[PDB]
Write a protein that binds this ligand. Structure first.
Ligand SMILES: Nc1ncnc2c1ncn2[C@@H]1O[C@H](COP(=O)(O)O)[C@@H](O)[C@H]1O
Lengths: 146, 150
């Protein structure tokens, strides 16, 4: 947040998924991410916890035109796997002439397929990612002597 | 119908998508050290056709556990069942056979994770937090975005 407004990563949805992604990116790159969260209470709690998060609706074209389309964004993470959130936000992003990368995480197989078909650069399954992270974090915390 | 886990050092209870990602992630780092237990016979067969050591069985059933040989190098159990109470029941079964190694669990909500810790697991992680972490990790590795680090 050295230069406010200059986030290079947008994380759309700051539930547990978005937050996990936010924390990982911070660890690697420092403070280059902005998370977007529709629930105001949730956004305020993230800000209290020291994360760069604002409230707003990633399906609203005006929020895109007024706020999110800054010209600095290199990567957008779609972390709204329920209620067609990912696909709806993707639609808005594509209307804007966005030249960066897009990645999505989805709950089911056919959902990943539709996201890739609609032009996301990379798509992942929530649970397969969770299993991979789980195994790493366990080996980190417990250091089993294999 | 005794079950000899052989050289397995990790028992993975539940081989749905979570257990499978864990199995594969461990295989990548440590080689063939895991044994998956899966209630769905057709899923267990599909895992075996893919080269994974997976046997069918219900890890909530005391009769399943009675089949398992006390001789074993198992140092880590991953609780990756699809139903939260299943992980809790599996943990109880492991405790009443006096298992000494470590146990890790994954769940949906902080109360579930705290409850697993209270019940005796060594580490407890949230399914969706872990998903977001691995999501970001894999996106960076696949896509190699060019950021200015701050
Ligand atoms: N349109 C949206 N804009 C920003 N955040 C959202 C939007 N829809 C859902 N979220 C948040 O994304 C997270 C996961 O949402 P869900 O897709 O319901 O699991 C939750 O914190 C939601 O409040």
């Amino acid at each position: 947040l050295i230069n406010p407004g200059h986030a290079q990563v947008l994380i759309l949805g700051m539930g547990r998924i978005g937050t996990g992604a936010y924390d990982e990116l911070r660890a690697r790159y420092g403070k280059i991410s902005l998370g977007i969260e529709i629930r105001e209470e949730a956004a305020q709690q993230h800000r209290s916890e020291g994360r760069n998060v604002i409230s707003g609706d990633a399906t609203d074209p005006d929020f895109w035109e007024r706020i999110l389309d800054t010209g600095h964004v290199k990567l957008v993470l779609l972390a709204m796997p329920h209620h067609q959130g990912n696909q709806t936000a993707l639609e808005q992003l594509q209307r804007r002439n966005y030249k960066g990368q897009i990645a999505a995480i989805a709950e089911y197989p056919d959902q990943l397929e539709g996201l890739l078909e609609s032009g996301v650069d990379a798509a992942f399954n929530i649970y397969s990612e969770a299993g991979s992270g789980f195994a790493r974090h366990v080996c980190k915390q417990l250091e089993p002597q294999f």
